Amino acid sequence: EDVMKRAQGLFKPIPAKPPVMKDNPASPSRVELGRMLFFDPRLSASHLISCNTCHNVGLGGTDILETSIGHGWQKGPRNSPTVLNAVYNIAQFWDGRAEDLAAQAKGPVQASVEMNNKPENLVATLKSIPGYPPLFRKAFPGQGDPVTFDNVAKAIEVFEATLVTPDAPFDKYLKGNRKAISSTAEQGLALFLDKGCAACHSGVNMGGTGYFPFGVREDPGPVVRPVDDTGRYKVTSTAADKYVFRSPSLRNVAITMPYFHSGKVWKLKDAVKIMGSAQLGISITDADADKIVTFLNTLTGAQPKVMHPVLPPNSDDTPRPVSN
Amino acid sequence: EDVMKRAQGLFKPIPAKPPVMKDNPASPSRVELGRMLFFDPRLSASHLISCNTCHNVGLGGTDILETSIGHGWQKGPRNSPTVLNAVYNIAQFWDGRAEDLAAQAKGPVQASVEMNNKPENLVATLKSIPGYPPLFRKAFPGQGDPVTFDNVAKAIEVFEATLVTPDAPFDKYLKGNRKAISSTAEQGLALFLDKGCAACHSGVNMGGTGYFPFGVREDPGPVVRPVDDTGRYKVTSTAADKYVFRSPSLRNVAITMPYFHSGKVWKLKDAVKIMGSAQLGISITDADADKIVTFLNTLTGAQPKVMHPVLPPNSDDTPRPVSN
Numbered sequence: 001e002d003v004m005k006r007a008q009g010l011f012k013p014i015p016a017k018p019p020v021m022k023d024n025p026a027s028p029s030r031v032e033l034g035r036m037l038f039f040d041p042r043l044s045a046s047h048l049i050s051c052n053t054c055h056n057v058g059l060g061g062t063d064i065l066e067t068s069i070g071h072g073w074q075k076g077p078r079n080s081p082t083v084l085n086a087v088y089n090i091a092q093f094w095d096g097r098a099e100d101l102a103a104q105a106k107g108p109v110q111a112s113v114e115m116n117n118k119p120e121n122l123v124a125t126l127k128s129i130p131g132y133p134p135l136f137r138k139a140f141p142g143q144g145d146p147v148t149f150d151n152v153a154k155a156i157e158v159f160e161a162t163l164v165t166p167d168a169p170f171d172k173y174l175k176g177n178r179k180a181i182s183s184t185a186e187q188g189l190a191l192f193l194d195k196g197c198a199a200c201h202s203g204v205n206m207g208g209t210g211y212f213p214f215g216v217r218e219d220p221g222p223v224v225r226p227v228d229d230t231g232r233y234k235v236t237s238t239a240a241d242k243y244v245f246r247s248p249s250l251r252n253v254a255i256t257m258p259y260f261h262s263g264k265v266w267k268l269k270d271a272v273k274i275m276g277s278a279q280l281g282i283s284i285t286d287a288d289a290d291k292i293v294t295f296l297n298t299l300t301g302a303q304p305k306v307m308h309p310v311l312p313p314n315s316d317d318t319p320r321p322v323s324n
Numbered sequence: 325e326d327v328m329k330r331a332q333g334l335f336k337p338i339p340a341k342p343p344v345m346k347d348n349p350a351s352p353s354r355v356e357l358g359r360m361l362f363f364d365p366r367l368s369a370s371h372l373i374s375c376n377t378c379h380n381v382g383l384g385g386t387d388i389l390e391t392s393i394g395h396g397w398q399k400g401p402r403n404s405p406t407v408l409n410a411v412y413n414i415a416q417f418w419d420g421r422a423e424d425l426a427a428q429a430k431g432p433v434q435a436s437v438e439m440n441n442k443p444e445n446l447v448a449t450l451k452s453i454p455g456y457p458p459l460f461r462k463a464f465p466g467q468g469d470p471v472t473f474d475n476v477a478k479a480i481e482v483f484e485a486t487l488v489t490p491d492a493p494f495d496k497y498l499k500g501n502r503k504a505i506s507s508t509a510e511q512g513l514a515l516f517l518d519k520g521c522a523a524c525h526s527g528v529n530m531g532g533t534g535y536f537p538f539g540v541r542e543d544p545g546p547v548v549r550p551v552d553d554t555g556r557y558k559v560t561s562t563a564a565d566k567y568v569f570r571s572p573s574l575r576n577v578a579i580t581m582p583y584f585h586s587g588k589v590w591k592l593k594d595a596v597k598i599m600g601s602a603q604l605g606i607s608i609t610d611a612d613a614d615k616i617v618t619f620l621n622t623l624t625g626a627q628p629k630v631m632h633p634v635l636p637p638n639s640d641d642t643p644r645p646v647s648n
């Protein structure tokens with residue numbers, strides 16, 4: 001009431017309807033093409049890794065590993081964040097280095113430790129699969145050559161735009177139903193507010209809104225915060241950016257373990273205590289941390305129900321997989 | 325007419341309704357659990373490989389690689405055959421070493437170059453995921469401890485039993501519609517019959533019915549037939565079994581390239597010519613091989629439309645992934 005209203009002041013429920021991307025209108029055809037591409041492992045050089053591998057729609061849009069493993073079984077430096085609701089973040093990646101989903105999508109396609117593919121190889125492959133060119137024409141009509149690395153990224157973005165998780169019990173709560181979360185969950189909300197967590201995890205996505213040092217008050221240590229990953233410093237070369245990362249969206253945080261960009265903290269409860277100490281210079285008690293987790297559990301929304309695409313088959317001209 | 329009737333004499337259309345497994349009744353709950361397990365990468369030690377990785381429902385129930393790659397990016401000796409209709413084969417694997425789908429399923433789970441998992445680790449993991457035990461109870465009621473390696477295999481088998489591809493244009497043809505395949509496809513059928521191919525690829529599954537040398541008339545060479553893979557000889561130790569493999573089902577063969585147990589022949593047309601020479605001591609002409617491919621294309625059925633499961637999340641007690 002006091003606390004319901006305070007909450008309504010800082011957060012917003014996820015909308016039912018996908019957001020509108022600029023310079024990228026959705027249409028059943030464009031959305032459908034992006035779904036196909038999201039699950040097509042032929043976007044990787046090896047023909048074995050899809051977006052779904054590291055952002056599994058079945059497992060909260062993530063891979064439940066410390067750090068993602070891709071081409072050659074190589075591990076990356078970072079935990080894979082969820083694609084769910086990612087559309088409502090202000091920029092993409094832990095260091096915000098991509099401005100939106102379309103710019104983001106080009107990254108994993110070319111990264112040597114993810115899909116390890118090159119644009120020319122991907123385009124050659126897509127044009128050699130006879131069912132794809134017609135789908136790119138329905139998706140991108142009035143273009144003489146619709147099969148381009150840019151249109152892949154565009155198709156994927158409007159598909160991701162549909163990957164939202166409305167109707168979490170907390171969104172029902174924000175919409176005026178007090179009974180939608182438990183007493184305990186409400187007390188966890190009150191702790192979350194009073195302790196200062198919403199400074200950095202607020203708005204429609206409970207996070208995703210800005211960049212902050214990981215360690216405002218204490219260094220979280222060389223395991224939780226690998227000294228080599230200076231976050232936004234590698235993007236801007238600005239000293240003030242060292243160890244600065246985007247605050248994540250806490251939506252669906254209960255099912256996207258492990259936690260932090262390093263993926264080294266498996267227990268959400270430990271994540272809560274580390275936030276208290278590292279960001280706010282406090283020791284949150286065990287009881288208190290438990291109440292905040294209970295609150296954080298009500299941020300899990302309805303998971304998208306995604307039909308696995310039936311992908312168009314190779315032709316004989318399809319490029320060969322590349323595994324080395 | 326002459327040829328439609330000859331065909332009706334040797335082949336049967338895939339039934340609409342999944343077959344009944346013995347000692348394994350289907351039920352919405354058991355089927356549903358097996359679907360979840362099929363797409364759950366936590367059946368592998370690394371938490372990254374599911375059945376769907378190497379038998380992708382989007383790509384004809386296969387992985388479109390020469391030979392499958394699994395744990396540690398290790399390649400196996402064999403091409404991954406389709407799970408689609410596999411239920412109608414007389415035994416499972418290229419060498420028939422598993423008698424049915426339930427016995428088959430235990431193989432990839434433990435194989436070091438596939439999922440590389442052990443039964444005790446898999447069971448511990450499944451029991452530690454709070455949403456799984458209730459699902460095993462709905463699937464296997466009246467069992468004090470339903471979460472067992474055997475029940476995983478059972479659930480998966482009744483799910484695979486639903487993964488059938490009815491209504492291929494050839495099945496419409498066999499059902500009395502002459503117009504259901506093209507003139508050319510009918511001439512390819514007539515070549516397939518006259519040349520002797522149905523000796524080994526007949527019945528409801530166009531194959532899957534028995535064991536034959538790969539090289540009845542000529543050695544196909546050390547690339548198409550790696551000299552180290554003696555097929556059924558490694559299962560029976562019987563000399564007469566050397567280089568004997570099960571005939572595959574040719575259903576959906578146009579979308580499950582590459583071909584043979586070695587996965588070394590990418591073009592179905594080359595596969596046809598190699599069958600002619602290796603199995604029947606003939607040189608099938610280019611024109612003739614083209615007509616047979618056209619026929620083989622009408623063996624592609626309606627692909628299952630499979631919802632990607634929303635999998636139950638880990639708890640904090642869930643075993644850690646193992647990547648090494």
Ligand code: HEC
Pocket residue numbers: 038043049050051052053054055067068069070071076078079080081082083086089091092093094095101104105108109113114115156
């Ligand atoms: C196929 C083209 C895709 C798509 C559409 C996305 N991914 Fe990934 N992803 C991976 C890792 C480790 C990260 C974090 C990297 C970092 O911050 O430096 C990402 C990040 C993303 C995002 C950003 C989401 C956010 O909230 O910041 C998005 C939208 C995204 N991915 C979508 C790991 C991998 C892989 C592992 C090997 C693979 C494959 C992909 N991603 C592929 C794709």
Ligand code: HEC
Pocket residue numbers: 192195196197198199200201211212213214216245246247248249250253256258259260261262268271272275276279280292
């Ligand atoms: C108040 C006590 C809280 C609570 C309960 C949480 N936070 Fe934060 N948070 C911030 C940043 C930049 C990050 C990313 C840091 C990194 O990994 O490099 C986080 C991360 C989290 C998580 C993990 C979520 C995940 O997907 O991994 C959680 C559960 C979390 N936070 C909860 C930024 C800030 C702040 C800005 C200065 C403040 C204040 C807080 N967080 C406080 C809290």
Ligand code: HEC
Pocket residue numbers: 362367373374375376377378379391392393394395400402403404405406407410413415416417418419425428429432433437438439480
């Ligand atoms: C997850 C538990 C599964 C399930 C249900 C199946 N698979 Fe595989 N599979 C792979 C390879 C290379 C083969 C051929 C191996 C050989 O013959 O020696 C298989 C075989 C099968 C079959 C047999 C089908 C037939 O017609 O003979 C079936 C039913 C089957 N699989 C189902 C490759 C892999 C993997 C690659 C790394 C993974 C993972 C799996 N399989 C996992 C599973």
Ligand code: HEC
Pocket residue numbers: 516519520521522523524525535536537538540569570571572573574577580582583584585586592595596599600603604616
């Ligand atoms: C008559 C000319 C044909 C045609 C068109 C095909 N076949 Fe056969 N076939 C047999 C066996 C044991 C195998 C497996 C061999 C191995 O890989 O070790 C095959 C394989 C095929 C394929 C490839 C299908 C695939 O999924 O990889 C194709 C397209 C094919 N055949 C077509 C057994 C026999 C026979 C038994 C002695 C005879 C006769 C034929 N095949 C003849 C033909």
Ligand SMILES: [Ca+2]
Pocket residue numbers: 062079080081256257258259260
């Ligand atoms: Ca995570």
Ligand SMILES: [Ca+2]
Pocket residue numbers: 386403404405580581582583584
């Ligand atoms: Ca094959």
